[PDB]
Every structure is written in C-alpha cells, then in structure tokens.
Amino acid sequence: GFMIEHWDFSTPMATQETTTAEHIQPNHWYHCERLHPDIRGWLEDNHVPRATVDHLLADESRPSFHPLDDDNFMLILRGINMNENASPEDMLSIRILYFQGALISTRKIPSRAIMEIRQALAEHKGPKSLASLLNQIIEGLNGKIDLYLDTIEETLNEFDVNDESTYNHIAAQKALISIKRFIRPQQYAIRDLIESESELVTSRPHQYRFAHNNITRINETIEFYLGEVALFQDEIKHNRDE
Amino acid sequence: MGFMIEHWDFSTPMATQETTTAEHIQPNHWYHCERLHPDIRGWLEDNHVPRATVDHLLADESRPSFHPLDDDNFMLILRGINMNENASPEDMLSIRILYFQGALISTRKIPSRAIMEIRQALAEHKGPKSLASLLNQIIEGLNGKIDLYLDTIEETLNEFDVNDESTYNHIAAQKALISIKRFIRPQQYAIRDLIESESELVTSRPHQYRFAHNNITRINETIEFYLGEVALFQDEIKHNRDEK
Amino acid sequence: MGFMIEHWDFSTPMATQETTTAEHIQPNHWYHCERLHPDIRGWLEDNHVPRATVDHLLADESRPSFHPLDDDNFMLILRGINMNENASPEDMLSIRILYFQGALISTRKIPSRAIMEIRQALAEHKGPKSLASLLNQIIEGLNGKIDLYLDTIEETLNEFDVNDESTYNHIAAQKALISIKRFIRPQQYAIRDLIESESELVTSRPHQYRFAHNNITRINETIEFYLGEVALFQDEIKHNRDEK
Amino acid sequence: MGFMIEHWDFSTPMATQETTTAEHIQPNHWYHCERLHPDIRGWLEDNHVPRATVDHLLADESRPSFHPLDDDNFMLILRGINMNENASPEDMLSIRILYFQGALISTRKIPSRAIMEIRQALAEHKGPKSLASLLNQIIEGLNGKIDLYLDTIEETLNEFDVNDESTYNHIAAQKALISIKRFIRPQQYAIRDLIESESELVTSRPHQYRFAHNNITRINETIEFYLGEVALFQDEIKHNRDEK
Amino acid sequence: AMGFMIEHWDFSTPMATQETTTAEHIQPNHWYHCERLHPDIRGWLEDNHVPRATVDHLLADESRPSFHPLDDDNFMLILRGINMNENASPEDMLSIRILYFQGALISTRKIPSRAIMEIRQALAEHKGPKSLASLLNQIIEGLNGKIDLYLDTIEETLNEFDVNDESTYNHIAAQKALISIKRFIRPQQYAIRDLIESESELVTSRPHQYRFAHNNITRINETIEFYLGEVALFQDEIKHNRDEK
Ligand SMILES: [Cl-]
Ligand SMILES: [Cl-]
Ligand SMILES: [Cl-]
Ligand SMILES: [Cl-]
Ligand SMILES: [Cl-]
Ligand SMILES: [Cl-]
Ligand SMILES: [Cl-]
Ligand SMILES: [Cl-]
Ligand SMILES: [Cl-]
Ligand SMILES: [Cl-]
Ligand SMILES: [Cl-]
Ligand SMILES: [Cl-]
Ligand SMILES: [Cl-]
Ligand SMILES: [Cl-]
Ligand SMILES: [Cl-]
Ligand SMILES: [Cl-]
Ligand SMILES: [Cl-]
Ligand SMILES: [Cl-]
Ligand SMILES: [Cl-]
Ligand SMILES: [Cl-]
Ligand SMILES: [Cl-]
Ligand SMILES: [Cl-]
Ligand SMILES: [Cl-]
Ligand SMILES: [Cl-]
Ligand SMILES: [Cl-]
Description:
GO molecular function (chain E): cobalt ion binding; cobalt ion transmembrane transporter activity; magnesium ion binding; magnesium ion transmembrane transporter activity
Family (chain E): Belongs to the CorA metal ion transporter (MIT) (TC 1.A.35) family.
CATH class of the largest domain in chain A: Alpha Beta
Bound molecules: chloride ion
Radius of gyration of chain A: 20 Å
Membrane topology (chain E): Multi-pass membrane protein
Largest interface: D-E, 22 and 26 residues
Strand order of the largest sheet of chain A: 2-1-3-7-6-5-4
Main location (chain E): membrane
Oligomer: homopentamer
Number of domains of chain A: 2
Subunit structure (chain E): Homopentamer. Can assemble pentamers in the absence of the transmembrane regions.
C-alpha cells in the first residue's frame, strides 16, 4: 500500500496507527509513496483539490511554499540522496501537505532524515506534535546537506597546485551547482513558511528562525566553496605559466 | 480563413463552438485570431477596443508582460516554443491576449501546440469549464511545452564527454538557452503581475494560478542551472586542452 | 531671439504654428529650442525658471532622468540614437525638457529624427492633439529610433560565422551596445519615475505611458540578449581556434 | 562550573569581578564561558534557556546572525580574525552571545584578542561601564582587529610589482579575503538586525551602534576593493606574460 | 599655519564675513573649516559638547562616505574628493568629514580640497554662498565637479586605446584608477541620498538643487561603470589580436 507510516499526534506521545486508514484526521501524520497508483484517489476522496494533488504529485518540482485554503498549505523540500549506488547531488524531493490539521508527506527517493524520525517515533522519543515534526523534517534535511557539504570541503582542502592528482575541482563544481539549484529555493521556501504565520510556526517561532538561519548558512557555504573552486582554477592557470 | 481562427462560447457550463463570422464580442466567449490578418484591427476597433491598445496588441515587437486596462480589462503577452516546420523551437512565438468586456481574445502569428491541445480538448467536450480555467490552461500549456523543449537540451548536456569531441555541442546549447531566457524571465514577471492585479480570472482560481507561477519560476531556475552546466563543460574542455 | 527653433500652440486639438519671438511662456504651448544658444538662459530666467534648474538643463554632462520640480513642473531628460550624417549613432543625443507653467520647453543640440518627424506631422495637420500626447510621442519616437538601430545590430549578429573572418565584427557590436546601455538603462527609470509622479500629462494617458515603459524595458532586455550573443560568439571563436 | 571563564557585575559603573561558580544568572552581570565544556548546557537549561536556543548557541556550525528571542532576550553571533599563535588569521573564531533575563552570556572556543583586551581593562578598573557599553566594545573590538589584519593585506597588495615575481603574493591574499568575506558580510547584517530590534542595549547608545555598523560596512567595501585589486594584478600578469 | 582652525565664516547675514580663527564657542550659522589631524581639535569639539563617540568617529583613521543623523537637527556627513596634492595620486581620494551641530557647519580635512579652496576664494571676493544650506550644496557639487574633471583624464586615456599600438596600452593603469574611485564614489551616492531623505533644513530649503547634486553623483557612478566596461572590452581586443596573429 501507498501509506508507509501513520502516526497520531493527538497527545505528546505519538501512537502508531493503521496503514489502511481511509480518512485524513486532524493531528495525524501520513507518510506516503508519491508514485503509488492508489495515492491520487485517496487524496481526492479526502477532498484535496485536483489541482493541488496535481502539483503535489507532479514529475517536476522546486522547493517552495504555497498557502492554500484556511490554514492549509503545501511545502516542498529537497534532500541529499544517500541511497546506495545513487548520485548524492541527484537530490530527493519531499512534498508535504498540511490539510485539515493533518500532515501528509510524500516521497519517492527515500530520505535518511525521515528514516531517523520514523525510528525515533518507533522508540517513543519522536516529535511531540505536528509543529515539532515539521521542524524536525526541515532540520533533518539541513543536517544531511551539511554532512554532504563536509565531503566537498574535504576535496577542496586537498587541492594542491603542485599535485595534479588533487585536481578534482571540476567534480566539486558540478556537485555544488547541482545542489545550489535547489538549496537556494529551499531558503525562500522556509522564509515563506515563517512569514505565513502558520499555527505550526507561531507555536515554535524561535526554532523555525534557527532552521532558517541554518539554510541561509548552507547557501553562504556553497557560495564560498564555489569561490574556492574558482580560486583553484586560477591557481592552476598561474602554475602553468610561472 | 478570415482573421478568426476559432470561437468558443463559455456562457454554458459545457463550452460550445460558434461561428468564426461572429462580428460582435460577447462576455464569456473566447475568440482565437490571426494577429497579422488585415481585418483584425477593424474588428477590434468596431467592438470599441481603443486604437492605442490595439496598436500595442498588434505591434511588431513585444515582450511578455501584463497590462491592466480599464475596469476588469487587461492585456497579457506571453511567449511559447516554436514547433513549426521552418523555424527553430527557440525562436519563441508571441501570444497576445486581451481580456476585454468579459471576453478573452487571443492572437497568434504562428500556431501554438499548447493552444492546439486546448482546442482539441474542447472539441472532445473535456476542455476548460470557464475563461478563468482557459487562461490558466494557456499559461500552463506554454510552460509544459517549454519543459518538453528543455528536456531536449538536458539530453545534449548529459552527453557532454570531454574525451569525445563529437559531443561538444555546448555552444549550440548556450545559444538556445539564452534565446529562451530572453523571454522566459519576463514571462515569470508577467504571471506574477497578473496574480497581483487581483483579476477576477485569478481570484476564481487563486491556488492554480500560484502553481502556474511556481512552474515558470522552476523553468527559469532550470535554465540557470543548464547555463551553469554549459560553463562548467567549457572549463573542463579548456583544462583538458592544457593537459592534452 | 535665435534660440527658438519652432513654437506650437496646443490650446486647440489642431495645433497652430506661432512666432519664434515669444517673450512670455504660455500654457499649452510647445517651445523647441537650441540648448547652446547664448540667449536661451536669459529667456528661461526671465520667465522665472530658477537659475539652478537652468544650470542643470543646460549642463555639459547629463543622464536620462526625471526631476519633479515644484507646482506641477518637472524636468525630463532623455537620449536618442544619433542619426545625423557622418555621426556615430552611439554618440547619443540628449533632449532636455521642462514642463513649466503648463508649457513644454524642449532643448536640443544634436538634432533628433523623432522630433523632426513630429514637426513634419504638425506641419501636415496630423501631429499630436495635446501637450500630453506630444510628450508621449517624443518618448515613443525616441524608443522607435533606438529599435531601428538595434535591428542593424541584430543583422550584424545574425551574420556571425565562425568559419568566415570577414564576419568577426563582435568587438564593434559590443562597443556599440555598451555605449547605448550606458544611457538606455537610466532611460527606463526616467520613464518609470515620470509615471510615478502622477503628472497631469501622464494621468490623462495611463495605459499609453505604461506601453512606452514596456517598450523601453524591452529595449533593455534586447540589449542584454545581444551582449550575451556577442559574448557567446567570442567563446565560439576561442573554441574553434583551439580545436582547429 | 569549570565552563565559566570570567564573571563581572555591571550593576554599578565600576564593574566588579565575581565568583566563577555562580549557579543562577543575575541581571546586569556578564558571564563569559567555554562553549565546548560539557557543563554549559546544564547551567543554561537550569537557568531556563530553552533547549532549542541552547542547541543553536552550542552548534558545531554557525554564521554571524541576530535572533530576537522572548521578552527583551536575543542571541547574537559574531566572527573575529584568529590572532592565536601559529593560527591562520582567516580561520575565524565565532563568539556566540545571549542576552538573557538582563544578563550577557558570551561563549567562546577560539580565544578573542578583543575580548582579552576588554577583560584586561576590567581587571585594570578601566573597562566598559555597563552591559550596553560592553556589547558595543565587543562588536567594535572584533571590527578593530579585522581592520588591523586588513592593513597587513593592504601592505602586501601595495608591494605588488608585475616585474618582480617575488611580490606575487596576491593569490595568498585572495584566499584570505574570500574566507573573511564569507562571514564579514553576514556580520554587517547581524549588526543591522541588532540595531533594528530596538533592544534596550542599543537604544541607550544609538549613535555609537550606528558608527559600529558604518565600520563593518566599510570593512565589507574595503574587502571588495582588495579583491578588485587582486583581480587587476592577475590580468596584469597575464598581459605581461603573453607579450613574450 | 600653527592652529587647528583654517578658516571661520559667519553666515548670519547673506554677505558672509570672515571671523577669528581663535578656538572659541561655536555659533549657529557659522562655518568652521579645520585640520582633522591637529592635536587641539578633539579638545575644542568636546569643550563644545560634541559627544565623545561622535568625535571618535569624526576623527577616526579609517572612514567611508556616509550620512549619520544625530540628536535634534544634528548630523555627520562624510565625503571623498580627488587628491590634487603632490606625492599623492588623484585616486587616493581625500576624506572631508562634516558635522552639522547646534546650527553650525564644522568641516575637517587632512589635505586640501580644490573644491573647498574655490569656495573660500569666492567668500574672500564677497561672491560666495549666502547660507549654510548653500555652502554645503556647493561643497557637494564642488567635489562632484572635480571628480568629473579627473574622469575626463581617464576618458582621454580610453579614447586613445589602439589595439595595434602597444604604446597605448594604459588600460591596467586606468582600471586601477577606476576601481580606486568606485570604492568611495558608490557610497558617496548613498550618503547624498541619505542626506536628502533626512529632511534636514539644509536640504528642504534647496530641495531641487540637492536633487541635481544627487543626479550628478549618480551620473558619475554610471560613467565609471561604463569606463570599466570599455577597459574590459579593450582587454578582449588585445587577447583576440594576440592569438589571431
Ligand atoms: Cl523539489
Ligand atoms: Cl524524489
Ligand atoms: Cl522517506
Ligand atoms: Cl535526508
Ligand atoms: Cl531568505
Ligand atoms: Cl512577447
Ligand atoms: Cl509570433
Ligand atoms: Cl495558436
Ligand atoms: Cl506552445
Ligand atoms: Cl516573480
Ligand atoms: Cl542625457
Ligand atoms: Cl545632444
Ligand atoms: Cl531636435
Ligand atoms: Cl530620435
Ligand atoms: Cl523600471
Ligand atoms: Cl559564526
Ligand atoms: Cl570559535
Ligand atoms: Cl575569548
Ligand atoms: Cl578578536
Ligand atoms: Cl546593512
Ligand atoms: Cl571617507
Ligand atoms: Cl583623508
Ligand atoms: Cl580644504
Ligand atoms: Cl576637490
Ligand atoms: Cl541613490
């Protein structure tokens, strides 16, 4: 079935619920397979408008925040692809709907950050509410981007002009532009979410601001790394003349 | 053909096809027209469209843009991929649309596949159910065709191999990308402005027009990424030449 | 007083040509003048144009700009293509205009083709019907000549052929485009600012001024595209030379 | 309790040194702490600093930033050049500051020469006379040290001579400059955001904080200029090597 | 020769009068032109109750063009001009730091500005500004005027670029000059904007004149960007010419 997980956040101790749930209920989280044949009917049966279902399930996407009817919204985010035999910069997309007090998330390429949240819920130490769950999805994705950026930084710190074996600047640059494509929009999506004054944000104002600070830092770090690559390229030009 | 290509009536929930010899503009009708036909100005002016707005609508040169006019009226100009036999897809066609006294009037020089697909949907009685939806579909249809074309560019970039000279189609790619960008950036701003006007067409379908705007933004960011990829390959070639 | 080139009375919709020895400035009149004539300062100051505003109007150096002055008065400065025989077209002319006590006073040094066409139309009883329309026609006339010149640049660009050194005119085209960009970018903000001022000369024709603003924006976008084309052809030459 | 480096009381304008084992935070006190010490979290949390705030204060990665918190509370994060023995200057230190319940709590890992100088002043009974002044001195202190370091880069850049290959220290200068730029830009915004919050610590010294902000703005512009000079020298070298 | 105060003028009346250069109490409608590096200036400013930190900023080693609204109607305005003194380059621009304080204009210099000399000469001939509002306007426009004159010398260099004549290749020198100018002239534009938006009595009495001065500095900035664009193109000209032939 399309429903990977279902949790009830009616109390601070989330309880696991049937993956055969027919109706969307307030305070519940549904984590779903985006490409499964049955998800469209389930969403539409539950009165999610056709056009918003279409955007949520579309092949193409960018990180973005979309205010919808009365407290509802869509939030789309990207994460690093940590799956085996995958290109990490071929970033996964998580598409989230906050609809009638429920959080519905959709995935295709599995997210390590989301697996950690799921594992925490199973061990009875997960988020205490939907507001906190969304916060942890945002920060978990940030965290995994930071880890990937550390591997780029290692490659960059290896750049030695007198050593041609360390000339990996083209690969790093390719990785960095691929990430920048989505991580820049990610920053604006989190900004827009906050400015929306969603009950999920206004209950955790300082925490969402910290999340926004981290995504901003990530973007500034990418810019710096791109500058380092450019500098190394000129250092190679300068070494070829001496 | 006179100037009028096709005429649809949305004053019933199921749109009906009407005569192309309609002489008067009626609310909730869509008139699809040849911009370069000699008779179009006369028809527009006779139906009380001001001469100066007709002049902008029929101008040789244009850019995608939104123009609020009197009352609920507006002009919206957009570009699309050129899928016609003697042209290049990147020499994008201009579609100039007037929303006037409750009617939609679209004008073309060269046919648009987006608009053709809408006309086929209406003929099969499964097209847009209103002018609001119709304009929404025109915008999203143009996006979709731009996406399709961009996929073709992506394939070219994906075959870039520095070790293989025959794959060095990076200059062609860049030419195409910058030709698209020329118009697709103002397209984003036109759609933003349309939304911000609070047009009755938009406010009936607010989330859907927001989604269309998200898609044009994505397209622009995709073009920027591809232009980055092209610049990267050009460095990869240059840095290979000094070793090679 | 030899500084006055031509004087028109727009008090009626059929403008009449008047004497060039006009002491007092009258509302709804247009005075077209030689900026560098020794008698022009004295005429302006005697008609109560403040000295510092005469200083700016007549200054040696200028940029396209809009200046709200007091009491419905303003100064507008614009640039045009130099179409004079044996001139360099990118040696652009500057037209400096005062809207002052309900009169339009324009000043020239390098003659403008757009203004000559307006004067010719007036001589034939088909010129603008008001000062509001006249100013709009000066702006759009200048836009139009810029478009014409840009078309010649485009021709040059379409003839780029990497395998034909007789076509390697990219340095000259780049030179022309940056020289025009210098003034054409401020021109767009000048027109934006004119519209924002809510001048009676603009509020009478809101849609028309937004079209003029759209044309100047287009020109700027076209210039950026052409520069991108030049930059690409430079890269093309560098790739071709290193590959052959 | 070994996390606390120093503790001062600013209740009076003569600040007094207090015990390094103060379990409860008091208004008008300054606590300067080791960020990496395992006991800091517990002390902050026992004093009712929310866990997520502590999480951000103590995180591995940071950028300069201002965070408005509850009820006059805030977090400010700033960077400083690294003046520790044998360190890279551009391996910049991060100072993370909480203003919480009327107390200033600063946290360090890499020691700040600026903060050491403020501490020496307090030990010599000539330090800042309030928490408002202390925060101002921390900001301006960090700035001052950056200015001093940048003067060394300026010397290096002025000694550059294209005919003397021993003066080619511009790429090392460039490495330093981009690394500093990375954080110095966010620093300017953090200080702007601090001022815009209308914090009691700022509104008591409004002109002083404006001057501090002008200084960081100047630092940014100077770095941009030095980066421009470096680029210029590189082109100078390219142009000097390709003449042979 | 020996003192901090260079000149003192009284603009109480439309015909300014030269007054004593003795370190006294400042008066509304007076202009005090001073040596910024003289040991005595800080004491005078503080004796006259200018706050310590404002004095620190005014007399600081480093500066950028900027506008600083202070208490009441007071402000600080910092500007840069061409350095037309010997053993300096024109592009090593001088900082002129100006305080409007209790209705007096206090300007400070390190090295002479030709713009301010010309105003001082006009005052001496009884043909100078008739008010502090006009004085400050003339300082701003005077500084613009001299930057324009220098930019003309750069234009001369540029117009003489000829790709087939290596003796004309002074584009490295020109670009260095331009980025050095741009460093300060960009902030100067914003400082003048900021001064205008403050609604200072010195600005509101001459609203169109100060806008013309703002238009002039904006024009200067655009001209600089254009010349920088011409230097980049001449670099492309050379590069093409070199490996084509
Ligand atoms: Cl996405
Ligand atoms: Cl995915
Ligand atoms: Cl997942
Ligand atoms: Cl993840
Ligand atoms: Cl943001
Ligand atoms: Cl168009
Ligand atoms: Cl077309
Ligand atoms: Cl069509
Ligand atoms: Cl299409
Ligand atoms: Cl937009
Ligand atoms: Cl001009
Ligand atoms: Cl002229
Ligand atoms: Cl003329
Ligand atoms: Cl013309
Ligand atoms: Cl604009
Ligand atoms: Cl930091
Ligand atoms: Cl640190
Ligand atoms: Cl420290
Ligand atoms: Cl420090
Ligand atoms: Cl700022
Ligand atoms: Cl300065
Ligand atoms: Cl100085
Ligand atoms: Cl002086
Ligand atoms: Cl000067
Ligand atoms: Cl400005």
